[PDB]
Amino acid sequence: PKMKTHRGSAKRFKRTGSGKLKRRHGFTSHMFANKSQKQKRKLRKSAMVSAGDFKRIRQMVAK
Amino acid sequence: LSLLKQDGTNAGEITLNDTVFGIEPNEKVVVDVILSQRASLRQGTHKVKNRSEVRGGGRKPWRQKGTGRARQGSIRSPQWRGGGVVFGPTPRSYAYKLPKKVRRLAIKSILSSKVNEEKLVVLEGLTFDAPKTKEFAAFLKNISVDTKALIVVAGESENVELSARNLQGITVIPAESISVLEVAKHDKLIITKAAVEKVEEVL
Amino acid sequence: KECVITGRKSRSGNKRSHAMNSSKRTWKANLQKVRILVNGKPKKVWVSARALKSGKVE
Amino acid sequence: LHELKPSEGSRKERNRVGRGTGSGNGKTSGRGHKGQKARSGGGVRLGFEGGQLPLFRRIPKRGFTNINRKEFAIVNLDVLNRFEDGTEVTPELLVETGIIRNEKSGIKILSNGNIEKKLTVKANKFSAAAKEAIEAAGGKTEVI
RNA sequence: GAAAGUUAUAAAUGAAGCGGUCUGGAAAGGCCCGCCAAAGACGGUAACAGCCCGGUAGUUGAAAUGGCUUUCCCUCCAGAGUGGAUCCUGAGUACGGCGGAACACGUGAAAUUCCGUCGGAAUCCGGGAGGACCAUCUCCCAAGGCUAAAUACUCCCUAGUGACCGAUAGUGAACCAGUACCGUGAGGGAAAGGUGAAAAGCACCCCGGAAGGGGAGUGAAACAGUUCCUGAAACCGUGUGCCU
RNA sequence: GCGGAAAAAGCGGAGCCGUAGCGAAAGCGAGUCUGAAUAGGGCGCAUAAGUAACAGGUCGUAGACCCGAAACCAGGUGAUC
RNA sequence: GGUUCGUGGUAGGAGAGCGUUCUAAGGGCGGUGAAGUCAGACCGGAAGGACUGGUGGAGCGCUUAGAAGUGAGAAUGCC
Ligand SMILES: [Mg+2]
Ligand SMILES: [Mg+2]
Ligand SMILES: [Mg+2]
Ligand SMILES: [Mg+2]
Ligand SMILES: [Mg+2]
Ligand SMILES: [Mg+2]
Ligand SMILES: [Mg+2]
Ligand SMILES: [Mg+2]
Ligand SMILES: [Mg+2]
Ligand SMILES: [Mg+2]
Ligand SMILES: [Mg+2]
Ligand SMILES: [Mg+2]
Ligand SMILES: [Mg+2]
Ligand SMILES: [Mg+2]
Ligand SMILES: [Mg+2]
Ligand SMILES: [Mg+2]
Ligand SMILES: [Mg+2]
Ligand SMILES: [Mg+2]
Ligand SMILES: [Mg+2]
Ligand SMILES: [Mg+2]
Ligand SMILES: [Mg+2]
Ligand SMILES: [Mg+2]
Ligand SMILES: [Mg+2]
Ligand SMILES: [Mg+2]
Ligand SMILES: [Mg+2]
Ligand SMILES: [Mg+2]
Ligand SMILES: [Mg+2]
Ligand SMILES: [Mg+2]
Ligand SMILES: [Mg+2]
Ligand SMILES: [Mg+2]
Ligand SMILES: [Mg+2]
Ligand SMILES: [Mg+2]
Ligand SMILES: [Mg+2]
Ligand SMILES: [Mg+2]
Ligand SMILES: [Mg+2]
Ligand SMILES: [Mg+2]
């Protein structure tokens, strides 16, 4: 049978042109009194999946 | 190349299309296609019984501890004499096709090989009034075959198939039915002018 | 144990807790023993309240 | 048929483990010693991290999918040079020739490349640059 | 209901070498000559056979029964147009609440479908659906029923096939096997194939109560002797070259 | 799928992958998103190769390298002890 | 073809091979004795391979490719 996509991941990662995965940052709901405005500006941007993580998860989101 | 009659006499010469019979043979492609065609003939009807499929074997043969025997789960576990087979054959298809373009190159290349080897005899006619194996055998002497030979014919000529049916190395086929493995299985390729037209019409 | 008019009878399904634990239960029809005459002669038969609603013998 | 040689490098002998120590894959058969990964059927599921919360759960879900998302078949100018000068390029002509096979939601013309010929291009959409470029050559764009 | 055709269930006919010679127990094998072939399938026959046998291709064949296909019989049968006064067009139904279920869809914003329970329409100026819901538009007309084919499976039958097994394999079962045997019972569940081409299966003599032997005979072989092709290893012995 | 010999071709372009990306999305497009920005920055382009088939390696779903529990559930059989 | 530096090794990675059954094609062996089996002081770097002779009494190699139920000394393994 066909491999199944990991749906949790398909709702969180996006594949870039070069074939990398782009993601959002964690600490970005609530508890915003506890984070600095600089932290907030940084956490608001997207990020790439690290090489180590990518090795672990790439089959989960092929397709 | 030359164009001889059933009797064996020369009838001028025919000009084979160089895009079908002239091309530089691609041996590597012909080998791939031969292997695929041999694989596709397999029936693959082979099975064994795994430990689930073998009769009986439901109960634990003796208690896990205390008897001084090796622990065993079923009398049909695979290390038991009449037990299940661990992997072993399962019914499966071995068939696969290379891409169409590679399959066309393969037939073009095997046919070009036969011309290079001077193993292709083009006949004006080939017909028999009645099914007569003696006549077909005499024909093969006149053409000077004395080997396995694939005979390709178009102008229906039902009497050709019957007349060559009992000869051991000889195969008669339509023209629509020419295949890499049938050309490879046979030394000489004898083809009627009418059949050459039909083969070039496709390639 | 079945409505003679309709065919209403017990059917199975789930009881569900908060927490959504499921366990099998039934739904019985609201069958009542009543005298009617389906065939000419009267007789005491199970009939659903729903079947009685409106026009039946009694 | 008695002298078949498959292309060199096209076929390789499969590796068979558990067939003695000489091979280098005998006994433990490449699995090393014990633990979950030595066992038949052994190994954790794909993104599993041994109980550390997996990456995908550390990060938030984002966005939605539009039920009415339009995706256009893209045609860069360069391929329009294929056509003869003073020719009327339609979608039907762009699929016959074999430039766009499936015309998803429509045909959009994009600038990428440079056009030489003076055409009359009709498509569902044009990039501002594409329109300018088709015209700069000496053509007319129509939006069907 | 007939009739005709055809298929099935028995069969019939069917080409060509006793060819020479070599080895051999035997020739189908070797060597050298022929021949048939719409037949060079398969099997058998004293070793490997197109031409020895059963057959095979091809061509024929059915008293009886069954199937199928046609034709006949027999049986059955109204279908267009024009209006729109009125009438009809599936009710405890649709739907709703409550509780469940089915929907890929876990009650969710939850359409659609079903069950229990309670409530309960409209009914052509009518009704349903288009994923809460309303409006518009579009497409449909529920609460009655029937319907072949394309699909699933094989205890069977017929004909075949296999880079499937070859007796610890392949069915549990090649052999009187669901037997023997075990179990109160449900149930569990084995082992076990091979003389030779042919019985020509060892007359007769000898030792022995017999078993079993030794001769003699058969046979190509008996160190093929009624479980009898081959006959490994463990293991058991006899003899003795070197050592103790 | 049709055709056929459990063929070979031929037919079959529906579909799939690639040829453009960026954005949650509307969308725009060699750019795009963010942003008041003609700024900077992210991902892309400028530094085109893919696709079909077979073979090797590894992974996923399947018992998934083999043997082994104690247990659990379902239908039966037992009070000749 | 030389030169230089190398060549202990468990888990483990990489490579090249041996042998087994089956298939195809080619080419062979075999009642003047096939496979199997027994023996030997032979050959190859290894896996392994021949030769000769006994037994055996009818099938079997080789070459190139292909496919795998493809290699056992251990499982208190099963018979
Ligand atoms: Mg928030
Ligand atoms: Mg079982
Ligand atoms: Mg002990
Ligand atoms: Mg077995
Ligand atoms: Mg290897
Ligand atoms: Mg190692
Ligand atoms: Mg070991
Ligand atoms: Mg270990
Ligand atoms: Mg480990
Ligand atoms: Mg924790
Ligand atoms: Mg005869
Ligand atoms: Mg003689
Ligand atoms: Mg014999
Ligand atoms: Mg014989
Ligand atoms: Mg409900
Ligand atoms: Mg559900
Ligand atoms: Mg609605
Ligand atoms: Mg209700
Ligand atoms: Mg509704
Ligand atoms: Mg809607
Ligand atoms: Mg929806
Ligand atoms: Mg209606
Ligand atoms: Mg058996
Ligand atoms: Mg045996
Ligand atoms: Mg058995
Ligand atoms: Mg005996
Ligand atoms: Mg319990
Ligand atoms: Mg009882
Ligand atoms: Mg008593
Ligand atoms: Mg050293
Ligand atoms: Mg080393
Ligand atoms: Mg390796
Ligand atoms: Mg053998
Ligand atoms: Mg032996
Ligand atoms: Mg094995
Ligand atoms: Mg042992």
Please, where are the H alpha helices in B27-99?
Answer: 27-41
d(CA D99, CA D144): 18
C4's enclosing H/E stretch is none
Residue B116 has which token pair?
A: 């290079």
The partner residues of C13 in beta bridges, in order of sequence, read: C25
Burial B11-29 (b: 16+ CB within 10 A, else e): eeeeebeeebbeeebbeeb
Q: Which nucleotide is nearest to D131 (CA to C1')?
A: F29
How far lies B98's CA from each of A33, B32, B202, C17, in Å?
65, 8, 18, 60
CATH number at residue D109: 3.100.10.10
Structural domain total, chain C: 1
Burial A41-54 (b: 16+ CB within 10 A, else e): eeeeeeeebeeebb
Report resolution (Å) to 1 decimal.
2.3
Domain boundaries, chain A: 1-63
Cβ-defined contact of D5 to B185 (cutoff 8 Å): no
* Domain span including residue D114: 73-143
* Domain span including residue C1: 1-58
* Residues near B160 by beta carbon (within 8 Å), at least 6 away in sequence: B126, B127, B128, B136, B151, B153, B172
- The neighbours of chain A, by the rule of 3 or more Cβ pairs under 8 Å, are D
Picking from B81, B129, B108, the residue whose alpha carbon sits closest to that of residue B22 is B108
Structure-determination approach:
cryo-EM
d(CA B151, CA B196): 12
Question: Would you say the C-alpha torsion C8, C13, C17, C18 has a positive or negative sign?
Answer: negative
Q: Do chains C and B touch (3 or more CB pairs under 8 A)?
A: no
Cβ-defined contact of D59 to A59 (cutoff 8 Å): no
The partner residues of B189 in beta bridges, in order of sequence, read: B120, B150
Residue D30 has which token pair?
A: 């490449």
